[PDB]
Design an enzyme around this catalytic site. Structure first.
Site, PDB file in Angstrom:
ATOM      1  N   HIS A  18      32.511  82.464  -5.933  1.00  0.00           N
ATOM      2  CA  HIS A  18      31.948  81.841  -6.957  1.00  0.00           C
ATOM      3  C   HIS A  18      32.537  82.297  -8.365  1.00  0.00           C
ATOM      4  CE1 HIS A  18      29.057  80.122  -9.674  1.00  0.00           C
ATOM      5  NE2 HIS A  18      28.866  79.525  -8.746  1.00  0.00           N
ATOM      6  N   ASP A  53      31.201  82.349 -11.505  1.00  0.00           N
ATOM      7  CA  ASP A  53      30.396  83.319 -12.137  1.00  0.00           C
ATOM      8  C   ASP A  53      30.499  84.678 -11.328  1.00  0.00           C
ATOM      9  OD1 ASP A  53      29.425  81.402 -14.068  1.00  0.00           O
ATOM     10  OD2 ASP A  53      27.822  80.698 -12.962  1.00  0.00           O
ATOM     11  N   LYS A  54      30.224  84.732 -10.176  1.00  0.00           N
ATOM     12  CA  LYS A  54      30.398  85.895  -9.514  1.00  0.00           C
ATOM     13  C   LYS A  54      31.859  86.739  -9.741  1.00  0.00           C
ATOM     14  CE  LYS A  54      26.703  87.532  -8.495  1.00  0.00           C
ATOM     15  NZ  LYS A  54      26.878  88.754  -9.391  1.00  0.00           N
ATOM     16  N   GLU A  91      32.472  91.171 -20.866  1.00  0.00           N
ATOM     17  CA  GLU A  91      32.369  90.001 -20.617  1.00  0.00           C
ATOM     18  C   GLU A  91      33.562  89.431 -20.106  1.00  0.00           C
ATOM     19  OE1 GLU A  91      29.354  89.709 -20.487  1.00  0.00           O
ATOM     20  OE2 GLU A  91      28.224  89.936 -22.469  1.00  0.00           O
ATOM     21  N   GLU A 122      33.396  94.579 -26.046  1.00  0.00           N
ATOM     22  CA  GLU A 122      33.433  95.782 -26.801  1.00  0.00           C
ATOM     23  C   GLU A 122      33.401  97.171 -25.929  1.00  0.00           C
ATOM     24  OE1 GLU A 122      30.489  94.030 -26.961  1.00  0.00           O
ATOM     25  OE2 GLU A 122      31.553  92.418 -28.250  1.00  0.00           O
ATOM     26  N   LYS A 144      28.311  78.868  -1.886  1.00  0.00           N
ATOM     27  CA  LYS A 144      26.939  78.808  -2.237  1.00  0.00           C
ATOM     28  C   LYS A 144      25.856  78.595  -1.166  1.00  0.00           C
ATOM     29  CE  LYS A 144      25.767  77.224  -6.511  1.00  0.00           C
ATOM     30  NZ  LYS A 144      25.718  76.480  -7.437  1.00  0.00           N
ATOM     31  N   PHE A 190      34.819  69.493  -0.915  1.00  0.00           N
ATOM     32  CA  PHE A 190      34.851  70.740  -1.702  1.00  0.00           C
ATOM     33  C   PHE A 190      36.321  71.330  -1.391  1.00  0.00           C
ATOM     34  CE2 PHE A 190      31.847  74.664  -2.462  1.00  0.00           C
ATOM     35  CZ  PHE A 190      32.634  75.246  -3.624  1.00  0.00           C
ATOM     36  N   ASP A 247      34.896  74.833 -11.766  1.00  0.00           N
ATOM     37  CA  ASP A 247      33.654  75.145 -12.504  1.00  0.00           C
ATOM     38  C   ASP A 247      34.053  76.518 -13.180  1.00  0.00           C
ATOM     39  OD1 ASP A 247      31.092  75.160 -13.148  1.00  0.00           O
ATOM     40  OD2 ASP A 247      30.625  76.498 -11.413  1.00  0.00           O
ATOM     41  N   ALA A 248      33.949  76.407 -14.707  1.00  0.00           N
ATOM     42  CA  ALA A 248      33.840  77.752 -15.218  1.00  0.00           C
ATOM     43  C   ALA A 248      33.082  78.633 -14.811  1.00  0.00           C
ATOM     44  CB  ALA A 248      33.847  77.514 -16.712  1.00  0.00           C
ATOM     45  N   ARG A 275      25.956  84.832 -15.565  1.00  0.00           N
ATOM     46  CA  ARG A 275      25.311  83.750 -15.217  1.00  0.00           C
ATOM     47  C   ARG A 275      24.695  83.447 -13.843  1.00  0.00           C
ATOM     48  NH1 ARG A 275      26.781  79.332 -18.892  1.00  0.00           N
ATOM     49  NH2 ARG A 275      26.231  77.848 -17.073  1.00  0.00           N
ATOM     50  N   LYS A 276      24.611  84.548 -13.140  1.00  0.00           N
ATOM     51  CA  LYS A 276      23.776  84.648 -11.876  1.00  0.00           C
ATOM     52  C   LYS A 276      22.889  85.653 -11.771  1.00  0.00           C
ATOM     53  CE  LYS A 276      25.603  81.055  -9.804  1.00  0.00           C
ATOM     54  NZ  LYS A 276      25.237  80.688 -11.339  1.00  0.00           N
ATOM     55  N   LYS A 324      28.220  96.659 -18.208  1.00  0.00           N
ATOM     56  CA  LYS A 324      27.664  97.569 -19.000  1.00  0.00           C
ATOM     57  C   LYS A 324      27.602  98.665 -18.492  1.00  0.00           C
ATOM     58  CE  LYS A 324      24.832  93.234 -20.602  1.00  0.00           C
ATOM     59  NZ  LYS A 324      23.698  92.921 -20.676  1.00  0.00           N
ATOM     60  N   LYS A 339      23.325 100.554 -21.982  1.00  0.00           N
ATOM     61  CA  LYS A 339      22.693  99.122 -22.017  1.00  0.00           C
ATOM     62  C   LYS A 339      21.570  99.111 -20.996  1.00  0.00           C
ATOM     63  CE  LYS A 339      26.767  98.688 -23.917  1.00  0.00           C
ATOM     64  NZ  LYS A 339      27.572  99.747 -24.461  1.00  0.00           N
ATOM     65  N   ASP A 348      19.577  96.869 -20.192  1.00  0.00           N
ATOM     66  CA  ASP A 348      19.450  95.704 -19.329  1.00  0.00           C
ATOM     67  C   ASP A 348      19.474  96.005 -17.986  1.00  0.00           C
ATOM     68  OD1 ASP A 348      18.950  93.626 -21.055  1.00  0.00           O
ATOM     69  OD2 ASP A 348      21.237  93.576 -21.812  1.00  0.00           O
TER      70      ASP A 348
END
Ligand SMILES: C[S@@+](CC[C@H](N)C(=O)[O-])C[C@H]1O[C@@H](n2cnc3c(N)ncnc32)[C@H](O)[C@@H]1O
Ligand SMILES: C[S@@+](CC[C@H](N)C(=O)[O-])C[C@H]1O[C@@H](n2cnc3c(N)ncnc32)[C@H](O)[C@@H]1O
Ligand SMILES: C[S@@+](CC[C@H](N)C(=O)[O-])C[C@H]1O[C@@H](n2cnc3c(N)ncnc32)[C@H](O)[C@@H]1O
Ligand SMILES: C[S@@+](CC[C@H](N)C(=O)[O-])C[C@H]1O[C@@H](n2cnc3c(N)ncnc32)[C@H](O)[C@@H]1O
Ligand SMILES: [K+]
Ligand SMILES: [K+]
Ligand SMILES: [K+]
Ligand SMILES: [K+]
Ligand SMILES: [K+]
Ligand SMILES: [K+]
Ligand SMILES: [K+]
Ligand SMILES: [K+]
Ligand SMILES: [Mg+2]
Ligand SMILES: [Mg+2]
Ligand SMILES: [Mg+2]
Ligand SMILES: [Mg+2]
Ligand SMILES: [Mg+2]
Ligand SMILES: [Mg+2]
Ligand SMILES: [Mg+2]
Ligand SMILES: [Mg+2]
Lengths: 380, 380, 380, 380
Positions: free
Chosen positions: D14, D16-17, D42, D55, D166, D235, D243-244, D249-250, D270, D274, D276
């Protein structure tokens, strides 16, 4: 009294030439919809990437994705096994409008015939009677060798060929009162990207027998001719993956192969208001007109411009001793017969027509009876 | 018997020249740590963007962000008011290793002296006794006009100047037995990016009085000299924002300004194994050696190579009628005195030294007593 | 019986929020010309760079350069001294058409009311009676603190402020039969980018007196409230130069600040056929309708979809014990009063209107009486 | 008393993954050489392009070309026929150093245990006794369905599968005193990219028989279970071409599938500073420790931080009514047993170890006995 001279050419899939063809595909796409599009499109190619960078002010709606990918398809990069694929590569666009400071200084509110040059610069035209094309034999042969490779790739007779190729031809010449007379081919280089399966000897044999002998007259080839065929020994990695490409990095391949002179301006991606292209085309037209008209056997023409100024700053003619007329007399003939303002050249050479992608491989001169290749009948 | 000839130059902040300087800053950064770095770094510049694309195999650890931004800082693009800022622009890197197919064909397992040429191609060297620099007056003057602009910008006397500039000089010449003798300056163009506040007449007056008269001997200037100073009328938008830049798009500015000939290879961003640079430098060295040695007044040298092959394929000498020796005799002198293999040129010209960013504006030839500008004493 | 809860918000110039606003500026630009544009525009921001990546099929002609730069201008990044400048940054576009496989599966040849969901996924709506906005106090306060910073920047009272900011609010709550009752603000964080000249104590004093006290009722602030104001000590580098931004990386800031739940879908850059946006807006509308209608004090709504299927796969209602009706009864009320097909939501919520850039900072919910914030009168 | 709940998961390919895995491959590459690398990487993916933006301050020498391409190879995008190829895609790098303003505020000159949080933010941990994994059944099943697809692709039993997939699972639940008890699977969605040759019915049959029945216990499946298998109907175009993708985003797929709560921070790319990532991992560890320790059946943990401050600003425990102890008592137990400073979490959870690429698909929690999945024995 003999000397050697060498020229090179590259194939359609050479990464620099990919960029020239893409830039001119973009130009043609704009011109198809807006004959007055202002276009300055540079292209950069590297692994998986076509980047468009530059300035376009146009009323056209152009699908850059489609235009770029179709140009790459035409070249033949259609699978990851070849190192590049039009279907799956990245196409990035960094195109802005033409600078309004340039627009106001060059063309806004100006009568078309009196448009200023789009930039300063110098340009040369050249012609030589050594071939019917009025071009140096060294580069004519170099181009034809690349065209032959593309032909044998596309018809399936050498299916191990890929699109990226380079050739180089060294000719031994004699001179005759400033004109040049080819005697023999001294050395030929051919390097061409290939599949993983074909071996080196099969390639070298094919390049000699199916490419060189098919293109170069046997009268120019002898026992002493030197062949450097796949001289690196292996060329599987190629196209932009092997070597970054940029528009306007094959300006000598595009022109006269080291003969004559060059003022440094690239052709591809530029509309007629960029005198780098229009005035160089005009200068070729002048040179060819002088030779086909019987005034010279060989001639170099320089012109130069200032941004915003319509008429050339300077015009110079160099005939290598091959005319009975002085260079000053030839200059007067040129001034009486040609108007080298860009807004007149555009009309004489039909430079709003979207034929530019066709110019972007195998040289801009010496083929296809483009308007700048049809001599003007001179009055004097 | 007189003729005109025109050459141009561009400033340090011209977008193409920005790219040449960045490419050579990258090369120098690699060479500082790894003298044997293999470097083929192209740079593209457009609004807010420096992109590096190409191939580098090196043991160096190079901070591309820092290297690129420091080069842009040096040029003088340090604020958004100028159209470009080293502190805040985008720096994108698309650099891969050198193709292993190229590496195996060129240099792997080879004795340094017997390294193959890094590519095929042709190259020319030129020298002319018309100046002490052994360079055409047209381009010498064009370069000095840009250098003057940068000087007056950097010392604050014309604080409205920005880094992006172009100049063009047309000289009227006479000829003497193949040598050329400058008579007068016929036309000068200067275009330079400027701030929003300065008016056109102030700029034109300054360009005449503080730039042209400071650079060009008055003996060359007269009542008839034509001046095109800020001919577009407005040049506030400049640098990459006004016009995309690419490495290797000023190859005639880098060399002889239309005089002599060019084989098409760019210099910047390339290590010595790329004969586009090393052999062109060597060819200049040969040409300059022939003229300073008193054998010719003016001379053009061609050389050519095949990828993977150490020795040149061809060498040619053209003396324009300015020697008592035949061109064949001069060729024999060259062959006895120079070894034009890239792995020998590197030693003679010290081409692993990180001095390349200094070559990347104001021409590669005719200044600073670089090794290729120090004539070799010839034995014959 | 008390507990703490914390939510954050970010300012308009936070690099992720820059991307959300750009993506929605692009969407709005398309919708202005083509109400049925299919838009999936992601934005990435880093030093000097805005990149658009994604899929758009539209009849609109959109000038991406202009649209992007105008959005950055609005945010306030207009000079290299601030770390980013709309006038001189790079804008790169990697936008292709919508996949035709998606188009055929979702919307081609379908009646608008029966368009399939644009993707699978899950979405939640939430409402709480603790504020008139029907939103958690923690995030309402966090948003208002960022809005205050932007106000004081734009009116010139704190001219050292830059656009990049973050805030975080911790509230002590009590609960009452599943509803939540704010008692006091326990901790506030504010970090905001600033100029080089202002000192830390001046900033901390201003953030307390001109920002916090202007936004947060004094009844929530006491001697024990903890303030972390410019806790890093220095924040001169900011915006994309300090931290890369991406669209859809502030999905909790966009929604309920940690309260309720989130199904993971981003909002910005997407047209109504993307149920990540339309169905989440609808779910908020349902939740708010239940609370303002007096059926619940607090409620969470889940919905989910399959690509190509119009009706939701599942609908769930969770009322935290704050209704006399069972969750099953509320579900029946929702099913009788709402049609959650995307092609009906579009009509009820007017989702072809170009109002999306306005949603892309300060939360999508709880402000401005957007259609999803106007409760539906329920029949039961 | 029953309700539905839906969660989704996505496959390794996918888009994003892909980005999450690349970002974490970059992190791991740095950590292998420099355990103290500061990393904020990123990734963006679109047709033919991987862009790294962010960074990194590290002593490592990382070959980004190699690292990125190897991650894409692992995923299975190895041919233009699949829409993306690690060998020939573009890899672009826009990586700068960490902001020195951040570095001085967070970690410079600080004792490791007393390092500040790398940012402000909020984070949640969750655990539920409904599965041995202490995870919601809905997302456990969704992940296992994607893992099954990858297994059958890689072992060649369904050679028409591509990497992009998905899944979505809706479970009917009952509740018992705040805990949740799965009853049956209500609906399953599976969409997976496929080759041009396989037909729809063959795919649907395989997805039911070889994927669903292999993963989901038959006791959860019945006559009424709804299957949406390849619901779009086609598909073939997939991965970044369709799809970008972007990192982070997941975030709900990475965590609890809509259950519990989310504070909005992404994990991938990260380092431990971080919060997060480190504090969300710690919060999971706390939640799981409370449930496996027998204090709760289900629990949500919130924590929050300010940039530059070591200790959390707030800690909150919500036990859904599933403990005999009050939430305040559980909070006291947590405070006595855990030190949630990032510089202590790093030691307890071994967060300098390069194991992050393994976390970046199939969820960060509920598998593989990572340190945050090994319950701490609690003293109280
Ligand atoms: C040799 S490369 C240029 C130098 C290169 N950038 C480097 O990193 O060394 C220039 C051109 O030569 C051709 N070429 C690429 N790989 C080659 C190989 N293995 N053998 C021969 N020619 C090659 C392609 O046409 C390519 O565009
Ligand atoms: C005229 S531009 C080239 C054509 C341009 N790409 C276009 O879109 O028309 C080439 C160079 O001329 C100079 N230039 C840019 N703007 C100019 C202006 N307003 N007046 C004169 N010269 C300018 C800069 O040195 C620039 O790199
Ligand atoms: C701290 S940064 C994120 C981590 C960062 N990518 C790194 O390399 O460590 C996240 C956000 O915090 C804010 N920020 C940036 N620099 C800051 C500083 N010096 N002090 C406080 N907050 C800062 C900005 O809003 C930025 O988008
Ligand atoms: C449907 S796309 C998202 C919307 C899309 N950006 C657009 O332009 O409409 C999201 C994901 O769904 C999956 N996908 C892509 N093409 C698909 C298709 N033809 N059928 C079903 N799912 C698809 C892929 O996993 C992709 O990343
Ligand atoms: K020319
Ligand atoms: K190159
Ligand atoms: K040359
Ligand atoms: K240009
Ligand atoms: K949601
Ligand atoms: K970031
Ligand atoms: K979280
Ligand atoms: K997307
Ligand atoms: Mg090249
Ligand atoms: Mg030019
Ligand atoms: Mg140029
Ligand atoms: Mg070349
Ligand atoms: Mg972020
Ligand atoms: Mg989604
Ligand atoms: Mg996505
Ligand atoms: Mg965050």
């Amino acid at each position: 009294g003999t000397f050697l001279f060498t020229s090179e050419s590259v194939g359609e899939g050479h990464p620099d030439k990919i960029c020239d063809q893409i830039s001119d595909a973009v130009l043609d796409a704009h011109l198809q919809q807006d004959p007055d599009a202002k276009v300055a499109c540079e292209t950069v190619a590297k692994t998986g990437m076509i980047l468009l960078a530059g300035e376009i002010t146009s009323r056209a709606a152009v699908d850059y994705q489609k235009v770029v990918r179709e140009a790459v398809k035409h070249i033949g990069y259609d699978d990851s096994s070849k190192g590049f694929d039009y279907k799956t590569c990245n196409v990035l666009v960094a195109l802005e409008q033409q600078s309004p400071d340039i627009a106001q200084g060059v063309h806004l509110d100006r009568n078309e015939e009196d448009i200023g040059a789009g930039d300063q610069g110098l340009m040369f035209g050249y012609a030589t009677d050594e071939t019917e094309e009025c071009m140096p034999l060294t580069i004519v042969l170099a181009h034809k060798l690349n065209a032959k490779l593309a032909e044998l790739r596309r018809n399936g007779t050498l299916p191990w060929l890929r699109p990226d190729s380079k050739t180089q031809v060294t000719v031994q010449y004699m001179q005759d009162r400033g004109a040049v007379l080819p005697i023999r081919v001294h050395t030929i280089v051919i390097s061409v990207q290939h599949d993983e399966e074909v071996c080196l000897d099969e390639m070298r044999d094919a390049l000699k027998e199916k490419v060189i002998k098919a293109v170069v007259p046997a009268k120019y080839l002898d026992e002493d001719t030197i062949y450097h065929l796949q001289p690196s020994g292996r060329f599987v990695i190629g196209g932009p993956q092997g070597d970054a490409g940029l528009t306007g990095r094959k300006i000598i391949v595009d022109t006269y192969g080291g003969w004559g002179a060059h003022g440094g301006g690239a052709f591809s991606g530029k509309d007629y208001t960029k005198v780098d292209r229009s005035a160089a085309y005009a200068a070729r037209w002048v040179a060819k007109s002088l030779v086909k008209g019987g005034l010279c056997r060989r001639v170099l023409v320089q012109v130069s411009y200032a941004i915003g100024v319509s008429h050339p700053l300077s015009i110079s003619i160099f005939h290598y001793g091959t005319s009975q007329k002085s260079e000053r007399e030839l200059l007067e003939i040129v001034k009486k017969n040609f108007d080298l303002r860009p807004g007149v050249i555009v009309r004489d050479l039909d430079l709003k027509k979207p034929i530019y992608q066709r110019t972007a491989a195998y040289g801009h001169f010496g083929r296809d009876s483009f308007p700048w290749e049809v001599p003007k009948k001179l009055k004097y």
